[PDB]
Each structure stands twice: as structure tokens, then as C-alpha cells.
Amino acid sequence: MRLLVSCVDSGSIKEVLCNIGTDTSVQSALQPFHVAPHLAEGLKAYVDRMWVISEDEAILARNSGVVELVKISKHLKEPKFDISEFEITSSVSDLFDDAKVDGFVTLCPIKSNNTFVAATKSGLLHIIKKGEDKKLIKLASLGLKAPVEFLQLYDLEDYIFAYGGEENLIKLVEIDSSFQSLKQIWEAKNVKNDRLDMRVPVWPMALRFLEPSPGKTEKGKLNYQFAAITRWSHLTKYSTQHGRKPFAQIDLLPNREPLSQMEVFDAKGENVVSSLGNFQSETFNELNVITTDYKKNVFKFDGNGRMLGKVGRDDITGSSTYIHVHDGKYLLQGGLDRYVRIFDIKTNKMLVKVYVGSRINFIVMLDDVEIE
């Protein structure tokens, strides 16, 4: 299989080529065929996010406040296989507002489009297009309420997106197709005080949409369903037909153990999500998510908050900075302990473990082809 790993320590991207069963910590196991650095820009400009447009092209968003267009080419290496080369063809810069530490939380297509969104923690929503001259051009920079932990586009209809942050209630926003204007259409409410009559803090960290609620729907209310993971160990479930308060807020771990990330998954490894990771279902009872704490654990929960078991419990020793469910059956994992890992979703089995010599914050799987 072919992976790209964002190595923050060198501000670079490494291509990793290895077969299933690879484990660089066990010398008797399979070892990688190829690891090489690319586009090293230093700790001052490490990659925040990537999005692969095709096998020939990708787009990067760097912690220097720069979005780059990348051309990917293949070369025969001189056990036969090709290796990649990367050339930056266009870029857009000064996309941060540290004065309002900034970073890119979202980098994904808006919809034939050539148009992408790039959202910052400082509450900037940049719209960037690959024009006919094949150059990147910024179409707009819309302002949101800071701070922003996440921005999730809605791509499941049966443009709309949700965003939120520290003491920044979840908001649904409608943006015009000109990208020059947006309108807030919904804001969540906090839940009641707890058993000790104390205010429940608000800190949504990640959100995934579900399909609209079924049955007959009331006029005057939207019909959007979504679930969110909070920084206070909550699983919050929303249905706008019910109201602005969540219809359920569930404590996932004791003592409000902080959490980040939310990856939808099916227990048998089926691909049940949209291109942006939204759950293609209308029932919360089928929802399962993967999340991480700031210690070393990777947790799996069902829609009711039951812990379904940990991933790499005995192998992961550092905080899992990045997780991603790829095409239903793969879990990409990388974090502070500097090993890039691939797990099987259904069997929970670790398929790949490769030391990359740097902290990891993003991984993409270009293909899963075995090399022979």
C-alpha cells in the first residue's frame, strides 16, 4: 500500500510503501520497500491538512497560513514499484489571523467544481478555486465566530455547514453559491445544570451529520441530524426538528476526560459514509464513532455511548493526534509516538506499523495495492 504521512518535525510529507504485515519494530516482520521525504519546509510550516484530488494532484494546507496545489507524478525506482514526486504549482498565503495558535481545521471540496474550503481556528472561511489557468485563486474570506475547532460541510441531501469551538455553541450556516455571503440559520443551546446544579461547559470538538429525521416533519423548523464529540467527554446528539438543545448528551468517560476527533465506522468495515465523512443513515442506533483522548488511547463507541473496545491498546504509547476511517475498512492512525499505523476495522488487527521519525498529524492512503 501507498501512504503519505505529514511529519511535523521536518514540516514535510513522507511517502511510505509497504505490504500488509509490515512492522518496523519487529525485525522478523515485513519491512517497508520505500520511505522518502518530500516538500520539507520546516517546523514553521508543517502540513495541517491534505486532500487528494486524484492520483495526479493534491492540495495542502500548511501551518504557515499557506494553501498549496501539488502535482503528483510517478517514477520507476532504481520487487518492482513506482515512487512519487511532488511539485508545487500554485499557492495562496496569509490565510491566518493569530491576533484574534491558528491552524487549518478543514480542507475539502465544496462539491466539476475545482473549488475548496479552508477554515481556520481563528474563524476564517476561505474559498479557493483552481481556475482555468490551473492556478489557485481565492474567491472569498468569510468571517465566523472564533474560536473554531471544526467546520463540517453537509453533503448528504435527502451550501450548509456546521462549526463550533470552546464555549462556542454549534451553529448551522448557509453560504451562498457566490461564496460572498453567509447567514446563520441555527444555534445550539446548552443542556440543563447537572446533578450538582452546575453549568455544563461547552466545547464541541468534532461533528458528523446524519440524514434528515424520517416521518412527517414540522413546518417552521429545519430537519438536520448530527452528533458531536466534546472536549468534556460528551457524545451530543442533535435533531433540529426536536429543537436547539440536544436530545441526548452522554458522558463517555469518567471525570470529563478530554476528547478530540470523531470518525464514523461500521462494525464490519462497510463504507457507510459520504465523501466528507457524514453518516449515510437516519437512525442514531446504527452510529458508531472512533475518538481519541490526549493520553494514548483510541476509543470506539456506539450511538448510545457504550465503549466498544480500544484500538492498539498495547502498541500505541503516545497521543493519537490523527485518526481517519478510510473507505470503511481501514483506520489510519498517527501521533506523538512517531509510528504510522493501519488497523483493520472489523478485526481490530494492526496491519501496518512503520516508524517515520517524527510526530504525525495527518495521513492519507493513496492506494492499498500489494507489491509483488
Coordinates of C-alpha atoms in Angstrom, one line a residue:
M1 CA 0.0 0.0 0.0
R2 CA 0.9 3.7 -0.5
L3 CA 0.7 6.3 2.2
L4 CA 1.6 10.0 2.6
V5 CA 2.5 10.9 6.2
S6 CA 2.7 14.5 7.4
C7 CA 5.9 14.7 9.5
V8 CA 5.6 17.9 11.6
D9 CA 9.1 17.8 12.9
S10 CA 10.6 18.5 9.5
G11 CA 7.4 20.1 8.2
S12 CA 7.5 17.6 5.4
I13 CA 5.5 14.7 3.8
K14 CA 6.9 11.2 3.6
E15 CA 5.7 8.6 1.1
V16 CA 5.6 5.1 2.7
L17 CA 5.4 2.0 0.5
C18 CA 4.8 -1.4 2.3
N19 CA 2.7 -4.5 2.3
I20 CA 0.2 -5.7 4.9
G21 CA 2.1 -7.3 7.8
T22 CA 4.8 -4.6 7.9
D23 CA 6.1 -3.8 11.3
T24 CA 9.4 -1.9 11.7
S25 CA 9.6 -2.7 15.4
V26 CA 9.9 -6.5 14.7
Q27 CA 12.9 -7.4 12.6
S28 CA 11.4 -10.8 11.6
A29 CA 8.3 -9.0 10.2
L30 CA 8.0 -7.4 6.7
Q31 CA 9.9 -4.1 6.2
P32 CA 8.9 -1.2 4.0
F33 CA 10.0 -1.0 0.4
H34 CA 10.4 2.7 0.2
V35 CA 10.3 5.8 2.6
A36 CA 11.3 9.2 1.2
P37 CA 10.8 12.8 2.3
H38 CA 9.1 15.5 0.1
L39 CA 8.3 19.2 0.3
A40 CA 10.2 19.8 3.6
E41 CA 9.5 23.3 4.8
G42 CA 10.4 23.0 8.5
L43 CA 8.6 23.1 11.8
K44 CA 7.5 26.7 10.9
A45 CA 5.3 25.4 8.0
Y46 CA 4.2 21.8 8.7
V47 CA 1.2 20.4 6.9
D48 CA -2.1 20.8 8.8
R49 CA -4.3 19.0 6.3
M50 CA -4.2 17.3 2.9
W51 CA -6.9 16.4 0.3
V52 CA -6.1 14.1 -2.6
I53 CA -7.9 15.3 -5.7
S54 CA -6.7 12.5 -7.9
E55 CA -3.7 10.2 -8.4
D56 CA -2.1 13.2 -10.2
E57 CA -2.9 16.1 -7.9
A58 CA -3.4 17.0 -4.2
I59 CA -3.9 20.2 -2.2
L60 CA -2.1 21.0 1.1
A61 CA -2.9 23.4 3.9
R62 CA 0.2 24.4 6.0
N63 CA 0.6 25.9 9.5
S64 CA 2.3 28.9 7.9
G65 CA -1.1 30.0 6.6
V66 CA -0.4 28.7 3.1
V67 CA -2.5 26.5 0.8
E68 CA -0.6 24.8 -2.0
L69 CA -1.5 23.0 -5.2
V70 CA 0.6 19.9 -5.6
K71 CA 1.3 17.8 -8.8
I72 CA 2.0 14.1 -8.2
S73 CA 4.0 12.1 -10.7
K74 CA 5.2 8.5 -10.7
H75 CA 8.8 7.3 -11.4
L76 CA 10.2 3.8 -11.6
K77 CA 12.6 3.2 -8.8
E78 CA 16.2 2.3 -9.4
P79 CA 10.5 -6.2 -6.4
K80 CA 9.4 -3.5 -8.9
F81 CA 7.3 -0.5 -8.0
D82 CA 6.8 3.2 -8.7
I83 CA 7.6 6.1 -6.3
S84 CA 6.1 9.5 -6.3
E85 CA 7.5 13.0 -6.8
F86 CA 5.8 16.2 -5.7
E87 CA 5.9 19.7 -7.3
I88 CA 4.1 22.8 -6.0
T89 CA 2.4 24.5 -8.9
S90 CA 0.4 27.3 -7.2
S91 CA -0.2 28.7 -3.7
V92 CA -2.2 31.2 -1.6
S93 CA -0.8 32.7 1.6
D94 CA -1.5 34.9 4.6
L95 CA -4.7 33.0 5.4
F96 CA -4.2 33.1 9.2
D97 CA -5.3 35.6 11.9
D98 CA -3.3 34.7 15.0
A99 CA -4.2 38.1 16.6
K100 CA -7.8 37.1 17.1
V101 CA -2.2 29.5 17.8
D102 CA -4.0 29.4 14.4
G103 CA -4.3 26.4 12.2
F104 CA -6.4 24.8 9.4
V105 CA -9.3 22.7 10.7
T106 CA -10.9 21.9 7.4
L107 CA -9.7 21.4 3.8
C108 CA -12.2 19.7 1.5
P109 CA -14.1 20.3 -1.8
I110 CA -17.3 22.3 -1.7
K111 CA -19.0 19.9 -4.1
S112 CA -16.6 19.7 -11.9
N113 CA -16.2 22.2 -9.1
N114 CA -12.4 22.8 -8.6
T115 CA -13.5 24.8 -5.5
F116 CA -12.3 24.1 -2.0
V117 CA -12.9 25.4 1.5
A118 CA -10.1 26.1 4.0
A119 CA -11.3 27.0 7.5
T120 CA -9.1 28.3 10.4
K121 CA -9.3 28.2 14.1
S122 CA -9.5 32.0 14.1
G123 CA -12.9 31.9 12.3
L124 CA -11.9 32.5 8.7
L125 CA -13.6 30.5 5.9
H126 CA -11.5 30.8 2.8
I127 CA -12.9 29.7 -0.6
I128 CA -10.2 28.8 -3.1
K129 CA -10.6 27.7 -6.7
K130 CA -8.3 26.1 -9.3
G131 CA -9.1 28.4 -12.2
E132 CA -8.8 27.7 -15.9
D133 CA -5.2 28.8 -15.9
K134 CA -4.7 25.9 -13.5
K135 CA -3.7 28.4 -10.8
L136 CA -5.2 28.7 -7.3
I137 CA -7.3 31.8 -6.8
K138 CA -9.0 32.9 -3.5
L139 CA -12.7 33.7 -4.1
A140 CA -13.6 34.9 -0.7
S141 CA -12.6 35.1 3.0
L142 CA -15.7 35.0 5.2
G143 CA -15.6 35.7 8.9
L144 CA -17.0 33.3 11.6
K145 CA -17.2 33.5 15.3
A146 CA -13.9 32.4 16.9
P147 CA -12.6 30.1 18.2
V148 CA -13.3 27.3 15.7
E149 CA -12.4 23.6 16.5
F150 CA -14.2 22.1 13.4
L151 CA -16.1 23.0 10.3
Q152 CA -18.2 20.2 8.7
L153 CA -19.9 20.6 5.4
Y154 CA -23.3 18.9 4.7
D155 CA -23.2 16.7 1.7
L156 CA -26.0 14.3 2.2
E157 CA -29.3 15.9 0.9
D158 CA -32.4 13.8 1.1
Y159 CA -24.3 25.1 0.9
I160 CA -24.8 24.2 4.6
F161 CA -22.1 23.6 7.2
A162 CA -21.7 23.4 11.0
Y163 CA -19.0 24.8 13.2
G164 CA -18.2 25.4 16.8
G165 CA -15.5 25.7 19.4
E166 CA -14.6 26.4 23.0
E167 CA -17.7 27.9 24.7
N168 CA -18.8 28.5 21.1
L169 CA -22.2 26.7 20.6
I170 CA -22.7 24.6 17.5
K171 CA -24.1 26.8 14.6
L172 CA -25.6 25.8 11.3
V173 CA -24.6 28.3 8.5
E174 CA -26.0 28.8 5.0
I175 CA -23.5 30.2 2.4
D176 CA -24.5 31.5 -1.0
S177 CA -23.1 29.8 -4.1
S178 CA -21.3 33.0 -4.8
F179 CA -19.3 32.4 -1.6
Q180 CA -19.6 36.2 -0.9
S181 CA -22.2 35.9 1.9
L182 CA -23.3 33.6 4.7
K183 CA -26.3 33.5 7.1
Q184 CA -26.5 31.8 10.4
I185 CA -29.7 29.6 10.4
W186 CA -29.4 27.7 13.7
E187 CA -27.6 27.8 17.0
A188 CA -27.5 25.1 19.6
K189 CA -28.4 25.6 23.3
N190 CA -26.6 24.2 26.3
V191 CA -28.2 21.5 28.4
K192 CA -29.5 22.0 31.9
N193 CA -27.3 22.2 35.0
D194 CA -26.1 18.8 36.3
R195 CA -27.0 16.9 39.4
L196 CA -25.0 19.5 41.4
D197 CA -26.8 22.4 39.8
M198 CA -23.6 23.4 38.0
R199 CA -23.4 24.7 34.4
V200 CA -22.3 22.1 31.9
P201 CA -19.3 23.6 29.9
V202 CA -19.5 23.8 26.1
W203 CA -16.6 22.7 23.9
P204 CA -17.6 20.8 20.8
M205 CA -14.6 19.3 19.0
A206 CA -15.9 17.4 16.0
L207 CA -19.2 16.8 14.3
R208 CA -20.7 14.4 11.8
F209 CA -24.1 14.7 10.1
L210 CA -26.8 12.1 9.7
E211 CA -29.6 12.0 7.2
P212 CA -32.7 14.0 8.0
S213 CA -35.2 12.7 10.5
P214 CA -37.8 10.4 8.9
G215 CA -41.6 10.6 9.0
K216 CA -43.7 13.8 8.9
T217 CA -41.8 16.9 9.7
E218 CA -43.0 20.2 11.2
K219 CA -43.1 23.4 9.1
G220 CA -41.0 26.2 10.6
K221 CA -38.1 24.0 11.8
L222 CA -35.2 22.7 9.8
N223 CA -34.6 18.9 9.6
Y224 CA -30.9 18.2 10.2
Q225 CA -29.5 15.4 12.4
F226 CA -25.9 15.4 13.7
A227 CA -23.7 14.1 16.5
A228 CA -20.7 15.8 18.1
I229 CA -17.8 14.9 20.4
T230 CA -16.8 17.4 23.0
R231 CA -13.8 18.3 24.9
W232 CA -15.6 17.3 28.1
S233 CA -16.1 13.7 27.1
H234 CA -19.6 14.2 25.8
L235 CA -21.4 12.5 22.9
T236 CA -24.1 15.0 21.9
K237 CA -26.9 14.0 19.6
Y238 CA -29.0 16.7 17.8
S239 CA -32.2 16.8 15.8
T240 CA -33.3 20.3 14.7
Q241 CA -36.9 19.0 14.5
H242 CA -36.7 18.4 18.2
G243 CA -35.2 21.8 19.0
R244 CA -31.9 23.6 19.6
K245 CA -30.9 21.7 22.7
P246 CA -29.5 18.2 22.1
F247 CA -32.0 15.4 22.7
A248 CA -29.2 13.5 24.4
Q249 CA -25.8 14.4 25.9
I250 CA -23.9 11.3 27.1
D251 CA -20.8 11.2 29.3
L252 CA -18.4 8.8 27.5
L253 CA -15.5 8.6 30.0
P254 CA -15.3 9.4 33.8
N255 CA -14.0 12.7 35.1
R256 CA -14.7 14.5 31.9
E257 CA -11.7 13.1 30.2
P258 CA -10.9 15.4 27.2
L259 CA -11.5 14.0 23.8
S260 CA -10.9 15.1 20.2
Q261 CA -11.8 13.7 16.7
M262 CA -14.9 11.8 15.5
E263 CA -14.7 9.0 12.8
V264 CA -17.9 7.2 11.8
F265 CA -17.4 3.5 11.2
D266 CA -19.4 0.3 10.5
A267 CA -18.6 -2.7 12.7
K268 CA -18.0 -5.0 9.7
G269 CA -15.9 -2.5 7.8
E270 CA -18.6 -1.4 5.3
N271 CA -18.4 2.1 3.7
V272 CA -21.4 3.8 5.0
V273 CA -20.2 7.4 4.9
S274 CA -20.2 10.2 2.4
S275 CA -17.0 11.7 0.8
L276 CA -16.8 14.2 3.8
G277 CA -17.4 11.5 6.4
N278 CA -21.0 12.1 7.2
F279 CA -23.1 9.1 8.2
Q280 CA -25.4 8.0 5.4
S281 CA -28.2 6.9 7.7
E282 CA -31.2 8.5 9.5
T283 CA -31.0 6.4 12.7
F284 CA -28.6 7.1 15.6
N285 CA -28.9 3.5 16.7
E286 CA -26.6 2.4 13.8
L287 CA -24.0 5.1 14.5
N288 CA -20.5 4.1 15.7
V289 CA -17.6 6.5 16.1
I290 CA -13.9 6.4 16.9
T291 CA -12.3 9.1 19.0
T292 CA -9.1 9.8 21.0
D293 CA -8.0 11.3 24.3
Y294 CA -4.9 13.3 24.9
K295 CA -3.0 10.4 26.5
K296 CA -2.5 7.4 24.3
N297 CA -5.9 5.9 23.8
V298 CA -8.1 5.3 20.8
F299 CA -11.8 4.7 21.8
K300 CA -14.7 3.2 19.9
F301 CA -18.3 4.0 20.9
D302 CA -21.8 3.2 19.7
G303 CA -24.6 5.7 19.3
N304 CA -25.7 5.2 23.0
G305 CA -22.2 5.8 24.4
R306 CA -21.2 2.2 25.1
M307 CA -17.5 1.7 24.7
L308 CA -16.9 -0.9 22.0
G309 CA -13.2 -1.5 22.6
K310 CA -9.9 0.1 22.1
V311 CA -7.6 0.2 19.1
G312 CA -3.9 -0.6 19.5
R313 CA -4.2 -0.6 23.3
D314 CA -0.8 -2.3 23.9
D315 CA 1.0 -0.7 21.0
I316 CA 0.1 3.0 21.0
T317 CA 2.1 4.8 23.7
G318 CA 1.5 8.4 22.6
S319 CA -1.5 10.7 22.0
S320 CA -3.1 9.7 18.7
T321 CA -3.1 13.2 17.0
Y322 CA -4.7 11.9 13.8
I323 CA -7.2 9.2 13.1
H324 CA -9.2 8.5 9.9
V325 CA -11.5 5.8 8.7
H326 CA -10.5 5.2 5.1
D327 CA -13.1 3.6 2.7
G328 CA -14.9 1.9 5.6
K329 CA -12.4 -0.9 6.3
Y330 CA -9.1 0.9 7.2
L331 CA -8.2 3.0 10.3
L332 CA -5.2 5.3 9.6
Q333 CA -3.5 6.3 12.9
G334 CA -0.6 8.5 13.7
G335 CA 0.5 10.7 16.6
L336 CA 3.2 11.5 19.2
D337 CA 4.9 8.1 19.3
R338 CA 6.0 8.6 15.6
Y339 CA 4.7 5.3 14.2
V340 CA 2.2 5.4 11.3
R341 CA -0.3 2.6 11.8
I342 CA -3.0 0.9 9.7
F343 CA -5.7 -1.1 11.5
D344 CA -8.4 -3.4 10.2
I345 CA -11.8 -2.1 11.2
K346 CA -13.6 -5.4 11.5
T347 CA -10.9 -7.4 13.3
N348 CA -9.2 -4.6 15.1
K349 CA -5.9 -6.1 13.8
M350 CA -2.8 -3.9 13.2
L351 CA -1.8 -4.4 9.6
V352 CA 1.0 -1.8 9.2
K353 CA 3.4 -0.2 11.7
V354 CA 6.2 2.0 10.3
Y355 CA 8.5 4.3 12.3
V356 CA 8.7 7.7 10.5
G357 CA 11.0 9.5 12.9
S358 CA 8.6 12.4 13.6
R359 CA 5.3 13.4 15.2
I360 CA 2.4 12.7 12.9
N361 CA -0.7 14.8 12.4
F362 CA -2.1 13.6 9.1
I363 CA -2.2 10.5 6.9
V364 CA -3.7 9.7 3.5
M365 CA -3.9 6.3 1.8
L366 CA -3.2 6.7 -2.0
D367 CA -3.8 3.0 -2.7
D368 CA -3.8 -0.4 -0.9
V369 CA -2.2 -2.4 -3.7
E370 CA 0.2 -5.1 -2.6
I371 CA 3.7 -5.0 -4.1
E372 CA 4.9 -8.3 -5.6

